[PDB]
Every structure is written in structure tokens, then in C-alpha cells.
């Protein structure tokens, strides 16, 4: 029914790292770093791998902060997105043809140029909350319906 994805937010006390994707799913929006989990890889190892592949950063310590299921009406496959945070990174963000990382101060997060669900759950991530979410989209711009709940265990 659902396909596993990861999403990693590099969140420091006064700034967050976002990446502008060049092509494919979500091109032209700022987002965290992530993608599909591979065969024989754990969700957390997938999250670490996608952070390096897309940002050039090395993370050791990840922690789980959320699980969000996305439905696109007319598309059979649900996206089961496992969301992680770190403050604890090595390396310099790498701009590549696929991805342009930038730091944002926490009061200048570019919500109008992000997926619209981020306006709902990012405020929970910034206050160190953990959450379970479901968003039903019509195409890439319109949230038809959603649920979002804070939890003590992701």
C-alpha cells in the first residue's frame, strides 16, 4: 500500500538547512533531504545516506521526529515518510546540479516556496515535538484533508 521515504532536517539552535531540488518530485521547492529507502537498508541508514548524497554532509546521530503519510488523489501508492532531525553534522553543504542547499534563520523559513504541509508540521519540529501526520493532496499545491497529532514515541 505504501512506499518508505526519509526526510532529514538539519536543525541548529538558530538556523535550519534546506535544499532546493533541480528536477523530479518537488523541483523548485525548498525541502529537507531524503528519498526512497533501499532493499536491505534500515530506514535510519537510508536517511543518513540520502543526507550525504543530496547535501554532502555526514551525520552520525539522527533522531526520529515524525512519520507522515502522503496521499496524492488518483495515485495508488501512499508515501510513508520517516522524518529525522540532527544538530550534529560534519562537512560543508555541497551544491550540485541536483540540489542547492542553503541555511535559513528560523524566522525566515521560506514556507511559501516549500511543500504546503510544512506550514503545519514544521512549527512542531522547531519546538522539539514529535508527530504523526496524514496529508491528502490534489496535485502538488492543494491539501484536501489532513490529520496531525503530537506523540511521545514516533
UniProtKB/Swiss-Prot annotation:
It catalyses: 2-oxo-dATP + H2O = 2-oxo-dAMP + diphosphate + H(+); 2-oxo-ATP + H2O = 2-oxo-AMP + diphosphate + H(+); 8-oxo-dGTP + H2O = 8-oxo-dGMP + diphosphate + H(+); 8-oxo-dATP + H2O = 8-oxo-dAMP + diphosphate + H(+). Changing residue 148 to A: Reduces 2-oxo-dATPase and 8-oxo-dGTPase activities and increases thermolability. 2-oxo-dATP binds at residues 6, 31, 33-36, 115-118. Disulfide bonds: none annotated. Binds 2 Mg(2+) ion per subunit. Changing residue 152 to A: Enhances 2-oxo-dATPase and 8-oxo-dGTPase activities and increases thermolability. Monomer. This is Oxidized purine nucleoside triphosphate hydrolase. It is an enzyme of class 3 (hydrolase). It comes from Homo sapiens. The N-terminus is blocked. Changing residue 43 to K: Loss of activity. 8-oxo-ATP binds at residues 25, 33-36, 50, 54, 115-118. Changing residue 81 to M: Decreased localization to mitochondrion. The lineage of its organism: Eukaryota, Metazoa, Chordata, Craniata, Vertebrata. 8-oxo-dGMP binds at residues 6, 21, 31, 115-118. Belongs to the Nudix hydrolase family. Residues 1-130 form the Nudix hydrolase domain. GO terms for biological process: DNA protection; DNA repair; purine nucleoside catabolic process; response to oxidative stress. Oxidized purine nucleoside triphosphate hydrolase which is a prominent sanitizer of the oxidized nucleotide pool. Catalyzes the hydrolysis of 2-oxo-dATP (2-hydroxy-dATP) into 2-oxo-dAMP. Also has a significant hydrolase activity toward 2-oxo-ATP, 8-oxo-dGTP and 8-oxo-dATP. Through the hydrolysis of oxidized purine nucleoside triphosphates, prevents their incorporation into DNA and the subsequent transversions A:T to C:G and G:C to T:A. Also catalyzes the hydrolysis of methylated purine nucleoside triphosphate preventing their integration into DNA. It comes from the Eukaryota. Optimum pH is 7.8-8.2 with 8-oxo-dGTP as substrate, and 8.0-8.5 with 2-oxo-dATP as substrate. Mg(2+) 2 binds at residues 50, 53. Widely expressed with highest expression in thymus, testis, embryo and proliferating blood lymphocytes. GO terms for cellular component: cytoplasm; cytosol; mitochondrial matrix; mitochondrion; nucleus. CDD domains: NUDIX_MTH1_Nudt1. Its cofactor is Mg(2+).
Amino acid at each position: 500500500a505504501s512506499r518508505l521515504y526519509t526526510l532529514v532536517l538539519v536543525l541548529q539552535p538558530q538556523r535550519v538547512l534546506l535544499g532546493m531540488k533541480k528536477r523530479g518530485f518537488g523541483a523548485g521547492r525548498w525541502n529537507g533531504f531524503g528519498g526512497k529507502v533501499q532493499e536491505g537498508e534500515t530506514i535510519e541508514d537510508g536517511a543518513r545516506r540520502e543526507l550525504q548524497e543530496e547535501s554532502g554532509l555526514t551525520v552520525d546521530a539522527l533522531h526520529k521526529v515524525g512519520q507522515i503519510v502522503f496521499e496524492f488523489v488518483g495515485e495508488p501508492e501512499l508515501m510513508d515518510v520517516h522524518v529525522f532531525c540532527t544538530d550534529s553534522i560534519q562537512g560543508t553543504p555541497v551544491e550540485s546540479d541536483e540540489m542547492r542547499p542553503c541555511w535559513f534563520q528560523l524566522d525566515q523559513i521560506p514556507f511559501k516556496d516549500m511543500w504546503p504541509d510544512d506550514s503545519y508540521w514544521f512549527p512542531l519540529l522547531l519546538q522539539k515535538k514529535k508527530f504523526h501526520g496524514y496529508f491528502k493532496f490534489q496535485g502538488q499545491d492543494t491539501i484536501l484533508d489532513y490529520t496531525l497529532r503530537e506523540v511521545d514515541t514516533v
